[PDB]
Symmetry: C2
């Protein structure tokens, strides 16, 4: 039971109980359990959940006759999707050009450069909006370049509808809540549609810091915006208490999941809350979030622009 | 794949065929196949193979009655073993103190600290030996303080005898060669013993740094030190690999197979490719399993992964 390619060693990620951070691991006289379960999407080829949509988008574009050998793929990305696409591009014989905001971490730049991706740096003030606009123009100018367009490509949502969701349901049939970051919206749209088909009364909860064409607000039951200090606090808590060295979006997710769990606890409801760990902490070390005390980390955040 | 504890989501790592890098993936008229298979030990809780010996050493100490609630583990390490023990100790309710020389890099320190290790800095001038002597002395002060000593602890070897080896035999029954780095020697000793017991004519091959180059190799072990775990009869061959070759191999691995590996993996691959070239020249069939002990992440600051391989290959 083995692989012929790194591309097959993707998905089927572990789901791990957070016995210490869970509001109440054990059912007892105070009330039923309120458990958190972490889906470890860092156990993927390039260490993030984006391997799932990146590979599916390329393979869907290949099946649709859109890609020839030595073709250039052009993608607007804040990093993880670019890295995933860079890895798949190396394996499959394509060139990759990423359009990224200029204020992305040094680690993301390093990984992209190592895989041989080229980078266009669009204005920080314009964010993902300007990155996308810039990629669109370049793609119009260069019709042979293939823009997969993670923000609107249904193979993104499909990768979660066919992978993340089925896996979660098999590991956690008692699931009551799924919590994840809301970026491209692929994870929540695909996983959330799958869960809603299969599980009566399941709740689909977004955490977050133009509107992607993938987004359907009807799939979400709740949406929470999380500040940088709370995301950092939670990220640190996760590695200190549960030994899971996660990226900062996972702290945002954990903040949201702990808010949901506190709500279940107060209502004496049973809850089994799955949350996405989208990547590990390696690419975020240069932020200072993991060093020293929380006091130090909060101080280190002053002046940073992500 | 549901686990109540992170400690259970350890081992059973993937084995990936390297079709592009292999000397000859398909059998045929030119001769039998010579295939490389990469064992991805970065798919472990802390991203390295050391999660195996670390957890097993703690569990064996527990079983032996050496570790009770509130105990402190002591280990002279600034590396992957310290990271792994920090994670595992924290999860099982123990304190960890890592003993290391005063001049240890801040990078290594930060990875240990974020997993909750405490650190005692032994005298810079004495290097590794003084760290080990200090850890021993500290452990001897207090029945609650226990040194595991990864270079001599048979639970290090046993983690591979009971995990890595069996997993390889299960995924690659046709295995002819196993290649890994030679550090504590746990990987090669335990996996090698296991495979030798089950596979006729299996070859166990070490990769290691050249003499006088352990520093560039990113390990703090002394030159003429022989781990108590080491048994030279287990090995068929040893490849001493230079720093430039290790870095080149690390890059070829990422470029041809997409695997972002740590530096020791480059040395391992160099060795495996040598073994492979020998099997090819002798028209023998080979299925060569090699260890990816960790991923590239913690080595980004070395400059070994810079876009230009010509600059990167001298970075160590
Ligand atoms: O949505 C993303 N990442 C994302 C979005 C779209 C594209 C990509 C990409 O890799 O190209 C990444 N991250 C995310 C999601 C949810 C919460 C947070 C977050 C919130 C507060 C502090 C830090 C991060 C960050
Ligand atoms: O043995 C190790 N690392 C090691 C040993 C014992 C403990 C630890 C640890 O991080 O805890 C690491 N590395 C290794 C093994 C084999 C070859 C190489 C190598 C050789 C040439 C250039 C670069 C690395 C490096
Ligand atoms: C992409 C990503 C998210 C959000 O997932 P989407 O499916 O794009 O909504 C969250 N965290 C990290 C680290 C990501 O890369
Ligand atoms: C430990 C280690 C080795 C050597 O393995 P041993 O089992 O200690 O011989 C090689 N590379 C890395 C990255 C390691 O952590």
């Amino acid at each position: 039971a083995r692989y012929d390619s790194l591309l097959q060693a993707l998905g089927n990620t572990p789901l791990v109980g957070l016995q210490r951070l869970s509001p109440r691991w054990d059912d007892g006289r105070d009330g039923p359990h309120v458990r958190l379960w972490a889906k470890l999407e860092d156990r993927n080829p390039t260490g993030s959940i984006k391997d799932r949509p990146a590979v599916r988008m390329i393979e869907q574009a290949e099946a649709d006759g859109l890609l020839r050998p030595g073709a250039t793929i052009l993608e607007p990305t804040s990093g993880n999707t670019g890295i995933s696409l860079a890895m798949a591009a190396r394996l499959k014989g394509y060139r990759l050009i990423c359009v990224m905001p200029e204020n992305t971490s040094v680690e993301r730049r390093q990984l992209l450069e190592l895989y041989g991706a080229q980078i266009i740096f669009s204005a920080a003030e314009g964010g993902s909006n300007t990155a996308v606009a810039t990629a669109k123009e370049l793609a119009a100018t260069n019709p042979s370049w293939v823009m997969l367009y993670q923000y609107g490509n249904p193979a993104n949502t499909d990768s979660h509808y066919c992978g993340t969701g089925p896996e979660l349901l098999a590991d956690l049939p008692e699931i009551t809540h799924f919590v994840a970051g809301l970026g491209t919206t692929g994870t929540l749209m695909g996983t959330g549609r799958f869960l809603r088909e299969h599980v009566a009364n399941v709740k689909i909860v977004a955490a977050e810091p133009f509107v992607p064409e993938l987004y359907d607000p009807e799939i979400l039951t709740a949406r929470y915006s999380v500040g940088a200090v709370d995301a950092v606090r939670r990220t640190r808590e996760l590695v200190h208490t549960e030994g899971i060295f996660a990226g900062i979006s996972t702290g945002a997710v954990l903040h949201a999941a702990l808010g949901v769990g506190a709500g279940a606890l107060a209502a004496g409801e049973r809850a089994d809350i799955a949350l996405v760990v989208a990547d590990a902490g390696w690419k975020y070390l240069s932020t200072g979030a993991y060093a020293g005390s929380l006091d130090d980390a909060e101080t280190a955040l002053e002046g940073q622009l992500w």
